[PDB]
Write an enzyme that holds these catalytic residues in place. Sequence first.
Site, PDB file in Angstrom:
ATOM      1  N   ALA A  30      14.986 -50.307 -15.998  1.00 13.56           N
ATOM      2  CA  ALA A  30      14.759 -49.090 -16.830  1.00 13.56           C
ATOM      3  C   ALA A  30      14.281 -49.537 -18.094  1.00 13.56           C
ATOM      4  CB  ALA A  30      16.303 -48.528 -16.785  1.00 13.56           C
ATOM      5  N   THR A  65      -4.497 -48.054   1.149  1.00 11.92           N
ATOM      6  CA  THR A  65      -5.022 -48.589  -0.140  1.00 11.92           C
ATOM      7  C   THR A  65      -4.980 -49.954  -0.544  1.00 11.92           C
ATOM      8  OG1 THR A  65      -3.230 -47.566  -1.421  1.00 11.92           O
ATOM      9  CG2 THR A  65      -5.240 -46.304  -0.985  1.00 11.92           C
ATOM     10  N   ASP A 108      12.811 -48.294  -7.313  1.00 16.17           N
ATOM     11  CA  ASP A 108      12.465 -47.666  -8.482  1.00 16.17           C
ATOM     12  C   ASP A 108      13.576 -46.859  -9.251  1.00 16.17           C
ATOM     13  OD1 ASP A 108       8.729 -46.784  -8.042  1.00 16.17           O
ATOM     14  OD2 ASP A 108      10.021 -48.781  -8.429  1.00 16.17           O
ATOM     15  N   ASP A 166      13.153 -44.057 -11.386  1.00 12.06           N
ATOM     16  CA  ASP A 166      13.213 -42.625 -11.248  1.00 12.06           C
ATOM     17  C   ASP A 166      13.182 -41.883  -9.752  1.00 12.06           C
ATOM     18  OD1 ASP A 166      10.507 -44.043 -10.481  1.00 12.06           O
ATOM     19  OD2 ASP A 166       9.344 -42.300 -10.942  1.00 12.06           O
ATOM     20  N   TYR A 192      12.294 -44.462 -19.462  1.00 10.81           N
ATOM     21  CA  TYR A 192      13.278 -44.577 -17.989  1.00 10.81           C
ATOM     22  C   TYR A 192      14.458 -44.831 -17.923  1.00 10.81           C
ATOM     23  CZ  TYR A 192       8.495 -44.379 -15.680  1.00 10.81           C
ATOM     24  OH  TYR A 192       6.976 -43.818 -15.021  1.00 10.81           O
ATOM     25  N   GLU A 207       2.375 -53.677  -5.740  1.00  9.24           N
ATOM     26  CA  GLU A 207       2.684 -53.166  -4.411  1.00  9.24           C
ATOM     27  C   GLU A 207       1.386 -53.606  -3.500  1.00  9.24           C
ATOM     28  OE1 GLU A 207       1.222 -48.876  -3.393  1.00  9.24           O
ATOM     29  OE2 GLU A 207       3.148 -48.777  -3.459  1.00  9.24           O
TER      30      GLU A 207
HETATM   31  O1  LIG Z   1       7.633 -47.366 -18.618  1.00  8.38           O
HETATM   32  C1  LIG Z   1       8.205 -48.073 -17.653  1.00  8.38           C
HETATM   33  C2  LIG Z   1       7.388 -47.902 -16.610  1.00  8.38           C
HETATM   34  C3  LIG Z   1       7.946 -48.496 -15.356  1.00  8.38           C
HETATM   35  N1  LIG Z   1       9.364 -48.681 -15.297  1.00  8.38           N
HETATM   36  C4  LIG Z   1       9.931 -49.278 -13.895  1.00  8.38           C
HETATM   37  O2  LIG Z   1       8.880 -49.408 -12.997  1.00  8.38           O
HETATM   38  C5  LIG Z   1       8.972 -48.483 -11.969  1.00  8.38           C
HETATM   39  C6  LIG Z   1       7.848 -48.195 -11.204  1.00  8.38           C
HETATM   40  O3  LIG Z   1       6.827 -47.554 -11.973  1.00  8.38           O
HETATM   41  P1  LIG Z   1       6.661 -46.004 -12.195  1.00  8.38           P
HETATM   42  O4  LIG Z   1       8.081 -45.303 -11.334  1.00  8.38           O
HETATM   43  O5  LIG Z   1       6.631 -45.452 -13.526  1.00  8.38           O
HETATM   44  O6  LIG Z   1       5.384 -45.469 -11.213  1.00  8.38           O
HETATM   45  P2  LIG Z   1       5.622 -45.318  -9.722  1.00  8.38           P
HETATM   46  O7  LIG Z   1       6.396 -46.060  -8.944  1.00  8.38           O
HETATM   47  O8  LIG Z   1       6.336 -43.638  -9.529  1.00  8.38           O
HETATM   48  O9  LIG Z   1       4.237 -44.957  -9.045  1.00  8.38           O
HETATM   49  C7  LIG Z   1       9.813 -47.000 -12.547  1.00  8.38           C
HETATM   50  O10 LIG Z   1      10.375 -46.624 -11.511  1.00  8.38           O
HETATM   51  C8  LIG Z   1      10.628 -47.925 -13.420  1.00  8.38           C
HETATM   52  O11 LIG Z   1      11.773 -48.576 -12.631  1.00  8.38           O
HETATM   53  C9  LIG Z   1      10.013 -48.752 -16.230  1.00  8.38           C
HETATM   54  O12 LIG Z   1      11.382 -49.122 -16.448  1.00  8.38           O
HETATM   55  N2  LIG Z   1       9.317 -48.316 -17.768  1.00  8.38           N
HETATM   56  C1  LIG Z   2      -2.580 -37.707  -1.274  1.00  5.67           C
HETATM   57  O1  LIG Z   2      -3.156 -38.586  -2.111  1.00  5.67           O
HETATM   58  C2  LIG Z   2      -2.022 -39.621  -2.195  1.00  5.67           C
HETATM   59  O2  LIG Z   2      -1.234 -38.994  -3.601  1.00  5.67           O
HETATM   60  C3  LIG Z   2      -0.276 -39.699  -3.686  1.00  5.67           C
HETATM   61  C4  LIG Z   2       0.480 -39.068  -4.944  1.00  5.67           C
HETATM   62  O3  LIG Z   2      -0.068 -39.065  -5.916  1.00  5.67           O
HETATM   63  C5  LIG Z   2      -0.691 -41.352  -4.138  1.00  5.67           C
HETATM   64  O4  LIG Z   2       0.469 -42.081  -4.439  1.00  5.67           O
HETATM   65  C6  LIG Z   2       0.006 -43.472  -4.996  1.00  5.67           C
HETATM   66  O5  LIG Z   2      -0.291 -44.219  -3.900  1.00  5.67           O
HETATM   67  C7  LIG Z   2      -0.728 -45.373  -4.498  1.00  5.67           C
HETATM   68  C8  LIG Z   2      -1.197 -46.536  -3.319  1.00  5.67           C
HETATM   69  O6  LIG Z   2      -2.293 -45.659  -2.579  1.00  5.67           O
HETATM   70  C9  LIG Z   2       0.532 -46.194  -5.286  1.00  5.67           C
HETATM   71  O7  LIG Z   2       1.847 -46.307  -4.255  1.00  5.67           O
HETATM   72  C10 LIG Z   2       1.010 -45.281  -6.399  1.00  5.67           C
HETATM   73  O8  LIG Z   2       2.440 -45.766  -6.809  1.00  5.67           O
HETATM   74  C11 LIG Z   2       1.481 -43.881  -5.441  1.00  5.67           C
HETATM   75  O9  LIG Z   2       1.686 -43.027  -6.683  1.00  5.67           O
HETATM   76  C12 LIG Z   2      -1.566 -42.017  -2.801  1.00  5.67           C
HETATM   77  O10 LIG Z   2      -2.149 -43.004  -3.543  1.00  5.67           O
HETATM   78  C13 LIG Z   2      -2.816 -40.850  -2.700  1.00  5.67           C
HETATM   79  O11 LIG Z   2      -3.409 -41.203  -1.413  1.00  5.67           O
HETATM   80 CL   LIG Z   3      11.888 -52.981  -7.748  1.00  5.18          CL
HETATM   81 MN   LIG Z   4       8.469 -44.576  -9.258  1.00  6.06          MN
END
Ligand SMILES: O=c1ccn([C@@H]2O[C@H](COP(=O)(O)OP(=O)(O)O)[C@@H](O)[C@H]2O)c(=O)[nH]1
Ligand SMILES: CO[C@@H]1O[C@H](CO)[C@@H](O[C@@H]2O[C@H](CO)[C@H](O)[C@H](O)[C@H]2O)[C@H](O)[C@H]1O
Ligand SMILES: [Cl-]
Ligand SMILES: [Mn+2]
Length: 263
Positions: free
Chosen positions: A61, A163, A129, A131, A65, A221
């Site tokens: 966090a 991806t 994560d 959030d 976050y 990822e």
């Molecule tokens: O400024 C930030 C950005 C990300 N995170 C951590 O990194 C995780 C994954 O990145 P984020 O959730 O922002 O993007 P997502 O996983 O939804 O694509 C977040 O859930 C948090 O646990 C954080 O602590 N500070």
């Molecule tokens: C419908 O298209 C999909 O939308 C999703 C939500 O925006 C996308 O989610 C992302 O996927 C990425 C990998 O391809 C990462 O996992 C990223 O953190 C996700 O937010 C999805 O890519 C897209 O195909």
């Molecule tokens: Cl994690």
């Molecule tokens: Mn997240």
Amino acid sequence: FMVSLPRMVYPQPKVLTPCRKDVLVVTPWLAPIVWEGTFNIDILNEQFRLQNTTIGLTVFAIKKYVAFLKLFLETAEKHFMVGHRVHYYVFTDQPAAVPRVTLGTGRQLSVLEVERRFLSEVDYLVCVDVDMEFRDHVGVEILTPLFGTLHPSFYGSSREAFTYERRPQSQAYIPKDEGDFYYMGAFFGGSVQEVQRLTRACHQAMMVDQANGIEAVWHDESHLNKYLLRHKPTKVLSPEYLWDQQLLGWPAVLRKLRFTAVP
Ligand SMILES: O=c1ccn([C@@H]2O[C@H](COP(=O)(O)OP(=O)(O)O)[C@@H](O)[C@H]2O)c(=O)[nH]1
Ligand SMILES: CO[C@@H]1O[C@H](CO)[C@@H](O[C@@H]2O[C@H](CO)[C@H](O)[C@H](O)[C@H]2O)[C@H](O)[C@H]1O
Ligand SMILES: [Cl-]
Ligand SMILES: [Mn+2]
Ligand SMILES: [Hg+2]
Ligand SMILES: [Hg+2]
Ligand SMILES: [Hg+2]
Ligand SMILES: [Hg+2]
Ligand SMILES: [Hg+2]
């Protein structure tokens, strides 16, 4: 040494009656794919409690976050490993901003301002994560040496659509004719040993890419997917464990929505 289970009364499993006929419940390397209806939680709870299993839940966090911690922790108290020993590890740059959440007995929380500690404190590590919020049961059915979770946007897609990092110059490279599933980096785990091996492998692989002036398309990822391709997880969690109802609704194939994104 595992103690014997006590007498238990439950529905007899039916060899000629498939668990689920709508989804794959076991991978080609014989790892269970966790869906509602595939497990009897009473049997599993018994097995893990008899071993006095301790689960560590890690979350980062940073910056704004920290605002997601209250809901995350409060819902984890209601749905995560209830009945078992849980140790939350909150990594943050704002220790004073961590909310005072009331915890059930046998559960603790440590704040780490930004480890051999993990090996001596917990049996399994679950990395997620922040959030997010728990909406239903997330228990010992997920525990195993190493597990990954199916990304909600690609569970029904062909590998060619995954991806993955497609550039050969990257250590996270995976060609179009390879790949089992697309795992989301927001929810993985396993034994402390296996999680540290994975984290160590990815860290080193990322350093190599950085040295070669390249950054994987989906960062951590992308590397997670490369690791799980070469080191098959011993359990795979269904999208029930990583969903977004606002963006994906609630399909029939999902009997429960357990862990979801926060709008
Ligand atoms: O400024 C930030 C950005 C990300 N995170 C951590 O990194 C995780 C994954 O990145 P984020 O959730 O922002 O993007 P997502 O996983 O939804 O694509 C977040 O859930 C948090 O646990 C954080 O602590 N500070
Ligand atoms: C419908 O298209 C999909 O939308 C999703 C939500 O925006 C996308 O989610 C992302 O996927 C990425 C990998 O391809 C990462 O996992 C990223 O953190 C996700 O937010 C999805 O890519 C897209 O195909
Ligand atoms: Cl994690
Ligand atoms: Mn997240
Ligand atoms: Hg079943
Ligand atoms: Hg972790
Ligand atoms: Hg983590
Ligand atoms: Hg890796
Ligand atoms: Hg990784």
